From Swiss-Prot:
This is 1H-3-hydroxy-4-oxoquinaldine 2,4-dioxygenase. GO terms for biological process: catabolic process. It comes from Paenarthrobacter nitroguajacolicus (Arthrobacter nitroguajacolicus). Changing residue 100 to A: Strongly reduced affinity for substrate. Strongly reduced enzyme activity. InterPro entries: AB_hydrolase_1, AB_hydrolase_fold, AB_hydrolase_sf. The active site is at 250 (proton donor/acceptor). Changing residue 250 to A: Abolishes enzyme activity. GO terms for molecular function: 3-hydroxy-2-methylquinolin-4-one 2,4-dioxygenase activity; oxidoreductase activity, acting on single donors with incorporation of molecular oxygen, incorporation of two atoms of oxygen.
Amino acid sequence: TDTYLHETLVFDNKLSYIDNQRDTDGPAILLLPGWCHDHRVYKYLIQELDADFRVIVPNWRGHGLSPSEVPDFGYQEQVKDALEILDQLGVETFLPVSHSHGGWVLVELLEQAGPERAPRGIIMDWLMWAPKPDFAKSLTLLKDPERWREGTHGLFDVWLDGHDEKRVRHHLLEEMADYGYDCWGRSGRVIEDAYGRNGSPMQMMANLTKTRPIRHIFSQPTEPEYEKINSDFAEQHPWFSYAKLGGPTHFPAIDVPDRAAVHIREFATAIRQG
């Protein structure tokens, strides 16, 4: 699976990316990481999809097996990076699939690339409402150079949700262990800025120039009030659907990869029949 790992120069920066280079019918599946992790979060998902789809995973600036400090940037830049990697690859039509706050990239990608290129989107486990106090606090801590690690530890708590989930723990404790304050502090300001200026993920999605099929697939928050904002948005919007996957953690791509795959396929197959 590092057998698909590549590095290319994208404007200023060298970025790593996964590309299985599969020669198959489109669309391509663009798996989009959230903040301060990389393609390793998708390694099980890649396996499920590897045969039948071409699978691309861009790593953001300063992200990868070897994280590095980079100048400040936000989701608009993540979007340009992703498209530039797609140009270099000669990829025309893609189905993007985001994790958590990678979603801001996904929704702006849908806008900029438009519905012929990007006709649908899948968002995984992305907090649909405006920050509640506990999350607002976590962001506060991530931005603070004295308390960022404390910041991350509280998020890991929420994310594992009282589960001894071996794979998810491995991702958080090992695969993200090399990411420092330059990333985490940035994630904090970019996400906080994103809610502030777009209201919420749902406000941002509803505001698309060309609305199109988007599904939210999630396991947490587990509470009925959260399912209800998702059911109410879906009642109000024909193009929106959701599925509650019932996995243990914030990372369905890791802990229920078969299930995430089944929704990606469904949306892939809908693109294949006009």
